[PDB]
């Protein structure tokens, strides 16, 4: 008599991919291999319901004992025992009793359905989570029997009018959606949780395969499990709207600011690319030093150099990062790119930005984060970081180490130049057998910028941008040819 | 006694691939994994029949309850309850009753066939849709029994003379066409719906494998599910006929118009390619500004820069996009390439063009749309966009960011240059250690165009195209060599 | 009533990936193919418990006889017989007796559980290891029966309150986690041991798939089995904190030290890259000679040249490595890269550093170690070596043979330049048909360094760094062009 209403799950990123949550009064199928977060998803569904909408929830477990479920939920800061004592949550223990011997007859799904209905009526439950129906159906080896029993369960829960989340099982990550293969077709809604193993690394993704009668974002979306539960990131949080401003921000190098027409833009992304030793880290350090000298908070996400090495280099360049950190203006987060996946790094960056509320951020060596990851996943990560930084009106400074040290015919082999607003090209220039460096403002959207490929030297005082090689040809090749007069 | 007549389905793009629709008086097999749109296809078949030809339809469901089918159809704006009340549609509920216990004997297909025949005679039905015969046949584990029962059903429905759509099931996207493997050979017509997972993205494709006694377009064809149902796009809508005209349209840069022999052609595709920062977005902005200054509607499909960043850059270039939007002359659609698949982007572009009726369109950075997609799918998308724009007599301006910033030996690594009519090559030119830019009209079909590689500078007033580097060699390499006199 | 406490295993690297060990009072599933170290892991778990925390352990074996288990443990220096005699360890022999005939009834898991409970009560056991439950469950061909029995066992061991390690079985390295496929879902914790075969080489990795109610590091982590048991290396031991100092260390070439602004840094990584014959080994030899002349211990990890060939070349260069070794100041470890995997090489390097306590280390030809290994695994190895060296305040000198001998447009095709602090670029320079060499300090973090591409010749006295090619262009190409005056 009406359209397909949805019930928000309040799981970060799930409601966005599901376009409003799970459909109301229907059964949703959550399928995934071991460790994919099925139990976590089901528990978070009820917990969020109870906490945000005061909707009593029912949890049906067939393997994990209720005590173990409550003990598990605490790792996320969830006190399920408090909810149980308040009558808001009820954990229906349907696990086989050890004292109960094997039964040769078809397991009584009718008794379980009656118990669930009684619990729903008693606690006025609006949400139901069913843990590992596959444990129930393994006694039902036949696939037809399994489909019939799932159909009975879904139809009964539908007649009761409760929103249900059923966790099922799969052997392969990209094989059958569920074990028997009849689970994904009896359910109205199918959610797939994967733990893809790529490059000796586990990537967790969530996919909404079908929402009968409703639109949803298609494909796999990476998600992480942290102290707050499941955190899904829908493809860079789409576009949104961030009103870019003309406000200028200094780069810490006055000559570079002149080269940029008055410094960088506050709501812009700066990309300093070049070969190793070109001074990208020096520009990042001067950027952070300028940020903090103006009593503005900043963060330095490093991924190649340790904290102490950064400190030593900054001190050698006349920058006291220790005093900056003591003043509470600078927070240096360094970490090896491998230590965690790109989604984990994005979550850490978001959390640090939220806790510190910085005005500027400097990520060192995006190339380091691109190690051993597919170009598509890397691009998704950069989209996420850039969008999040622009949304908070945060000035971003990113560095990318070019793989070729001279003759580099591309700005970035990952092709992130299309996403950045300002591009600083740093390169070596062979001059009289000496390896001079050159800095050029390759790109600046919305601002005039010096086209000069200007020489600069690195001293104890920082970078000193000199004149341009106005008597040389093919500087870009790294090996220019000098012309008389 | 006659040839093989076909019954139109009126599903956008299906009748084209099927060369007139589904054959009349025969059973069509619609096979696909979970969430492929089998139920949607079957429902749309009957709904389109009833609404466009007043042909009563019969829907046979074995899992989804009739109430749920009616509730599902509303997401597409279809009021199936109205049709049921009018006697034009009948939903035959054949789902197993929960109160009915298991039956050890072969399920009575004869009773179902008799019920379907009675319904067809009562409602004078010309169309029939059968939902998940696989649910029926899972009780028939044996494949031979399944083939026999499908043969009986198809033969009976054929004797009745109704056009039937049967939805069947598969475990793998590219595995067996159906579960048992006997379904695709008893049916006269086989349609395969796939939800291929590639690059963490779901691509939906429809394939007509065989139409016994009729020709059909071969292979997979992408299709999307939106608020209007299934929308199939047959390989760029073939050729068609768009009478190109000699009418000229200004580019917003008078010197560029002179370089093009009087501006671009109205019914032509313009491709501005170059490295990052070369000013492709500037040319797009001037193009849109010229379009709107002449009181002509235009659309800007951006995929790298946000709306506000485009606004800021345009204002910095003396272009007021806000006033343009207020006047109803400009509509700016920006969106990340990942947010949706290429078919979805094509559908969005088509819908926006239809709703706005623009005279010009400007897509920013086709390269952004090529991220993480196969070259073939990208090429298909460009063919679609170019053909649709040319059909509506719309002038298209596309930008492609070259992956190499100097020495680019190709116009486009995706090789779309063969599809575009006008090509504007933008490149950096190293001159006296300064990174000057160069604009050249690489290509212009049906018009004389300046061969000069002309220098241009970007100011607050826009691009100023200066003279050509007439005293330099190897400009194209990016690092030219100057010659005296 | 409390959070999820964990029990340390004291297995090197396991507690780090598991974030504190195995959860207390729960069953952990250790699955892996033949030879993956399941039995070794289970035995080490109990042995470490007993030896470090005085926690009595119970070992349940179904195939390996207790005598054979004790005999096996001695290869790691573990005297399990001493623990058994002390009552700290009990090996419960549950293997089928040869005199016991086949049983058609379901094997009595209840009797085994009662025996285990009796043993736990008698020895006050806190840890339990179960060897090859799969041998038990093969008589239970049915997967449902297997899941039920595993559930009974886990629930009973949980009620007893002991931490349990259960070793299960798999046929494929990346196939089902366990044989039946029900083992990984009844267990609260799943650990996967793999012996991946890549390039005719076996790579052993450990993965913690899920720790219910606790966070853990995700993905595969390489581990080796040596005379001390399982040794896991969690992704380079994360970041840690190594306070870099400004202390300078001589390179053995005074002119090179001048080029580096006073020599290399003590807590830094030096990378000498160049074509074959450029003199990387000469720089390594002079580095070691300077290390030992100052009465400082050093190690030379070679991977291309034999010990005697290194001796001969050093003597030809006026360096007496034999006297250095006799004095106990130099230890030369040479070995073919293939002889062992990257994890094995890392373990050997760590062990040698620990036994010798060197002040400097010189690894010859990282490129040799990159032969036939994925770039990701190689990068992980370099991260490990660099981090370990920096942690011990050890100066590292690494050499990388460039694959291209002239025109090399990159420092390292493996792109390790981002990880190194000092980069010495060695290259050939064609001059008047003579193949002169050139040395340039490409990079030096935290120090001024000469930008000059200086010629050097190799004599019996070592390298003699001459002036720079100040009258030549395109030296970097290898084929420079001379200019008059
Ligand atoms: N506080 C936490 N922070 C981060 N990750 C956590 C946290 N608690 C649990 N996890 C992770 O979440 C996963 C838990 O999965 P969950 O129990 O929800 O279901 P599942 O793995 O889909 O199915 P199964 O019931 O077979 O375990 C584990 O792999 C664990 O690593
Ligand atoms: N209004 C809509 N707009 C866009 N997509 C929709 C809309 N309504 C439904 N969908 C999508 O269409 C799909 C519905 O598939 P459908 O029910 O027709 O059959 P099927 O997936 O082939 O088979 P099954 O019966 O197993 O679900 C879902 O995956 C859903 O995402
Ligand atoms: N002292 C040692 N040093 C190095 N490697 C060792 C040592 N002792 C044993 N190994 C290795 O450890 C492995 C022993 O594996 P383990 O017996 O622990 O269990 P598993 O291989 O997982 O299972 P299974 O019970 O089927 O053998 C062997 O492959 C052997 O090469
Ligand atoms: N005190 C100094 N004087 C002059 N140059 C220095 C000094 N300290 C460091 N440098 C230079 O700084 C360079 C490092 O720059 P950095 O920003 O770390 O490069 P990257 O592009 O890899 O981030 C060194 O290669 C060296 O040339
Ligand atoms: N006010 C201005 N004056 C001169 N140049 C400008 C001005 N604003 C922007 N630019 C130039 O515009 C360039 C951006 O051009 P754009 O069309 O966005 O490049 P793309 O080819 O990436 O689309 C900047 O790199 C800068 O050189
Ligand atoms: N006594 C010598 N006099 C001059 N040159 C020598 C002498 N002994 C060896 N060389 C030079 O040393 C080079 C080897 O340098 P080495 O460090 O082994 O190169 P790599 O970069 O491969 O490690 C030889 O190619 C040769 O040019
Ligand atoms: Mg750096
Ligand atoms: Mg652009
Ligand atoms: Mg060598």
Residue numbers in the entry:
A (entry chain A), B (entry chain F), C (entry chain B): 19 to 503
Sentences from the paper on this structure:
In this study we reconstruct and analyse the ancient circadian clock system KaiABC (anKaiABC) of cyanobacteria that existed ~0.95 billion years ago, when the daily light/dark cycle was ~18 h-long. KaiC is both an autokinase and an autophosphatase that contains two phosphorylation sites: S431 and T432. KaiC phosphorylation is correlated with the dual adenosine triphosphatase domains located in the CI (1–268 aa) and CII (269–519 aa) regions, respectively. KaiC is the core component in the KaiABC system which can form hexamers; KaiA and KaiB regulate the phosphorylation of KaiC.
Likewise, anKaiC also forms hexamers as revealed by cryo-EM, however, the cryo-EM and SANS results revealed differences in surface hydrophobicity, conformation, and interactions between the ancient and contemporary circadian components. Dispersed differences in the surface hydrophobicity and structure between KaiC and anKaiC were observed. The sequences of the detectable part of the anKaiC A-loop (R492–T499, S-shaped loop) are almost identical to those in KaiC, and they have a very similar structure in this region. However, whether the structure of the remaining C-terminal part (R493–S524) of the A-loop is similar remains unclear because this region is so flexible that the structure cannot be resolved. Differences in the B-loop (A112–D126) and another spatial loop (S150–A160) close to the B-loop were observed, although its function remains elusive. anKaiC harbours two clefts for the binding of ATP molecules in its CI (KaiC-CI) and CII domains, similar to KaiC. Although the inside surface hydrophobicity of anKaiC and KaiC are almost identical, the positions and orientations of the side chain amino acid residues (R165, E187, D206, and R230) surrounding the ATP molecule, showed subtle differences compared with the features of modern KaiC. Moreover, subtle differences in the position and orientation of ATP molecules were also observed. These structural discriminations may lead to functional differences in the catalytic ability of anKaiC as an ATPase, kinase or phosphatase. The ATPase activity of anKaiC is much lower than that of contemporary KaiC, which can be at least in part attributed to the residues T233/N244 spatially neighbouring to ATP molecules.
